[PDB]
Amino acid sequence: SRVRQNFHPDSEAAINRQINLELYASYVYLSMAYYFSRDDVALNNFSRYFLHQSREETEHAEKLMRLQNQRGGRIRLQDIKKPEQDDWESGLHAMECALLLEKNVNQSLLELHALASDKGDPHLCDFLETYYLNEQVKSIKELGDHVHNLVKMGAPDAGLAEYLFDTHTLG
Amino acid sequence: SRVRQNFHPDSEAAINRQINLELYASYVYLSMAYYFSRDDVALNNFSRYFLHQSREETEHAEKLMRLQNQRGGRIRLQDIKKPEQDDWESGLHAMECALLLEKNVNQSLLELHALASDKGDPHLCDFLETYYLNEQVKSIKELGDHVHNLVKMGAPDAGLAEYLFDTHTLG
Amino acid sequence: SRVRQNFHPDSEAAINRQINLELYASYVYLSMAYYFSRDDVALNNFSRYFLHQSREETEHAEKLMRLQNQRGGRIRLQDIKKPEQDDWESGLHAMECALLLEKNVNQSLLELHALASDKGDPHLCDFLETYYLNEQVKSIKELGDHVHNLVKMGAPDAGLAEYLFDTHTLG
Amino acid sequence: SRVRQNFHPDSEAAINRQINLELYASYVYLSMAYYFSRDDVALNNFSRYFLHQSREETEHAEKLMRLQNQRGGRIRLQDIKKPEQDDWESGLHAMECALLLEKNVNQSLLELHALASDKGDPHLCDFLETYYLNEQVKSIKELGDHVHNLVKMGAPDAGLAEYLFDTHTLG
Amino acid sequence: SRVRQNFHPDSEAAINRQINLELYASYVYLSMAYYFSRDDVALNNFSRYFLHQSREETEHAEKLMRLQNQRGGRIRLQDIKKPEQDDWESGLHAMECALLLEKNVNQSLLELHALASDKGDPHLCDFLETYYLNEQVKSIKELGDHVHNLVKMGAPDAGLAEYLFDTHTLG
Amino acid sequence: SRVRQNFHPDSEAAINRQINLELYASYVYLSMAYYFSRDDVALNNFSRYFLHQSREETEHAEKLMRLQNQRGGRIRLQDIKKPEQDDWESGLHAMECALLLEKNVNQSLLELHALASDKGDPHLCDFLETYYLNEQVKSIKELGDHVHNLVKMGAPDAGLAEYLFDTHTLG
Ligand SMILES: [Au+]
Ligand SMILES: [Au+]
Ligand SMILES: [Au+]
Ligand SMILES: [Au+]
Ligand SMILES: [Au+]
Ligand SMILES: [Au+]
Ligand SMILES: [Au+]
Ligand SMILES: [Au+]
Ligand SMILES: [Au+]
Ligand SMILES: [Au+]
Ligand SMILES: [Au+]
Ligand SMILES: [Au+]
Ligand SMILES: [Mg+2]
Ligand SMILES: [Mg+2]
Ligand SMILES: [Mg+2]
Ligand SMILES: [Mg+2]
Ligand SMILES: [Mg+2]
Ligand SMILES: [Mg+2]
């Protein structure tokens, strides 16, 4: 390749893997998004909240796909695995799963950054530090906030709790 | 379910399958989209054209997911299969694959409409007739147009052809 | 904690210490700010200059407090020590003390960054690199500039010098 | 001093003390402010409410610092003591501590006014009467209101109570 | 020096060298810029494209000169070497030389970043990561794109190719 | 060449030389520009004044490069020599060097005009008369003015002088 400079094949692989992980999380949030528009769940702000997260994660993937073409790498796509559940059980459960999901995305991204360090790709280091490492910290903190309020409010057994969180926090 | 009326389990299954098919085509077009921003391909309008198609197909899926929740069905998601290639070979080849893809989407949708007919779901009939059956005819005709010009122009061997089509038709 | 990931207790402590250091510098600049509105000093631009620095440093502290809550840490506040003097002696002396102060803030921040490196917190690395390491370089260079002109002009013995610097540079 | 007229050294000392007290309350409210942005508390309006109080109290200090320079006195700053807690326990507890804090600020200010009376400083009397004595009465009444509603609503055991007060009163 | 902190003489030298390298590339692009306004070449968009690159590289140098004065270093300037050719041969050849040039600039900058790492200058690390390491990746990818299209189009023997690239891509 | 008419090879050479001279003066002024943003010099208007002169001289070069391509000549570039000093000593010294520099540029340009006269290039005569001969007279007179005031004010020993000239003339 005529553009490739200082781009280690293992970083290339790392990125391709990370692209799949970001697509997977977009799918998980799309699943949740339409879980909440169910007639027997019907929390439309939860539904809009997770649909926005989903499209946000698709943007994450595209940046990485864009990073692979910028550096000289070759995007190699894999199947996008279906989420662990179609029935996300409750607004609380969906927030806890979202929280657990993003800490794993964070892990993988922390692992990616580390590979880039051992390979002397400062550009890739700066890439993850700039667009991912802090997006994740805010996502994880925000999700943490949401998890905490819904527990303190009494979700999901308190019939009022998820309905109020929907209308007042996510509105 | 308290919303379900005149909604046959086989239509439900049909829809869930169709949702996966629409996600698959969105993925195929995303793959092509980033194929053309490669430094050794670098047809940015082809890349923008297929990225728009991709997001358009994601919208297709969401409507169907929305249709499933409206009728009383239960969205059951499957893995999203990786496309047949990561190297779409040329602007012409990518248009021919896109054309072949959409005729299959069309087939499945024609098959879905037929199931809905034999099951007496006029609502589902009208759904596909309204948002899908003609979107497909226009997609297939448009793709057909593109395929024809690029052949007539001499793609991909004519070095000028794909570059001009990029700048003048897809610009 | 449910948000904490890859956040070493020594980094937590480092941050809590740094928060106090940033509050301390805000206090030092508040002291200077009101030193210059004295009727027997009466350099109102010096006074406005240092009052702006003070509020700027309070902002520094808040970001760090915000960083501690984002990562899962626990803000643990300490007394805010009074400055070394209430009588900052002259506009020159106050600039030299400000310069010496910020090089220490810089030291501590350089030390903090180093801890984060040895602990594999790339997020915290990027945090300090983004909002602190360069703010400090500009502060130190700006203060350096000010120190130099006031010396070259003859502060504080030249009765004209501090009065002109006040009206022409800090105006 | 050439500006000093009718300004008793004990009033000067009183003011310097009061300046420290006003800085202390600003710090207490800053602590609370970031207590509520904790991921395991996450009441963002409580957090904004107390952060505004904090900056309001910093303004209190500055006026007094400004009063000292106007009259001929000499600002003599002391350490700013850390608050009694870093864990403000609940929105209710934080309001009760805020209420108790401001009644003490009020006490000290009432004591200051009294000193000024026995010393024949009508200017200082008018100063406190104009910018402090009523600011305090409104703060104390407002805090009283807040305390009462949160008790009546069932804070902190009622999971709904603090969450609703956050969104509906402090929003 | 009174501003210098944590600034290693070898980093200083590195920067001074890098400043010359950035001036050299500005000169190379100025040469190309006026190569294309030749009456026997006359590709005015190529000429405008390279003249913009040139001024962009002068900006690169100035930032580094600004970085040297900010940190306490001393700008030490060297001769600016004439480019390797005055006759850049063709639009394709000029793009290939530009591509090769920027990968070297990139190399030097990657080497500079590495020096800064071994010297514990995180500020200088962040400087290059922020304003240079990615500017280079985009330049190299963009130049790569251009190189590829002009080859695929048949430059320079195809009389149409450079003329169309001029009017349609660089217009 | 098909555009060349009445264009003597010695004029061509003259122009190529003059182009280098104009690049040299641009470099000298860039050096001065960043000399004054030094933390131990810190005359920001001097710095802006000389940075504007530098870009102005780059424009001079480009016109001559443009003149060479217009007439049929061939731009042949040489190394751009580093200036005589990196330490311009004082605002006065920098103005005196600038003054001496421009009288030499003027000399060379007067010499160029003379060559054009003996060669019967009235176009080149008119070129220099129109864009250079008077730009130089104004530059030299302006620089002369500046030199005179700074001497009369007492530069560089008078600590006030350069600082006031910076803020009041060059502001
Ligand atoms: Au789970
Ligand atoms: Au790295
Ligand atoms: Au195919
Ligand atoms: Au039907
Ligand atoms: Au000192
Ligand atoms: Au790190
Ligand atoms: Au209490
Ligand atoms: Au009184
Ligand atoms: Au070459
Ligand atoms: Au570093
Ligand atoms: Au000289
Ligand atoms: Au002539
Ligand atoms: Mg993500
Ligand atoms: Mg479709
Ligand atoms: Mg600070
Ligand atoms: Mg108060
Ligand atoms: Mg550059
Ligand atoms: Mg000139």
Author numbering:
A (entry chain A), B (entry chain A), C (entry chain A), D (entry chain A), E (entry chain A), F (entry chain A): 6 to 176
What does the paper say about this structure?
Ferritin ubiquitously occurs in animals, plants and bacteria, and plays a significant role in iron storage and detoxification. It is a nearly spherical 24-subunits-protein with exterior diameter about 12 nm and a hollow cavity of 8 nm. Like human H-chain ferritin, the ferroxidase centers of HuFtMt are composed of A and B iron binding sites of conserved amino acid ligands His65, Glu27, Glu107, Glu61 and Glu62. Herein, we take the compartmentalization concept to re-design the intrasubunit interface of ferritin to create a new compartment for fabrication of fluorescent Au NCs, while keeping the inherent protein cavity functional.
To determine whether wild-type (wt) HuFtMt are able to bind to Au ions, we solved the crystal structure of wt HuFtMt at a resolution of 3.0 Å upon protein treatment with gold ions. The refined structure revealed two Au ions binding sites where Cys102 and Cys130 are involved in this protein as shown in Fig. 2A1 and B1, demonstrating that Au ions exhibits the high binding selectivity for cysteine residues. The mixture of wt HuFtMt with HAuCl4 exhibited a red color, with extremely weak fluorescence under UV-light as confirmed by its fluorescence spectrum. This is most likely derived from the formation of larger-sized Au particles in the presence of wt HuFtMt. Indeed, the UV–vis spectrum of the mixture of wt HuFtMt with Au ions exhibits a peak at ~ 520 nm, which is characteristic of the larger-sized Au particles rather than NCs. Three Au ions-coordinated Cys130 residues are located at the ferritin threefold channel (a relatively unconstrained microenvironment), facilitating the excessive growth of Au NCs, thereby losing luminescent property. Three Cys130 are involved in coordination with the three Au ions, respectively, which are highlighted in red.
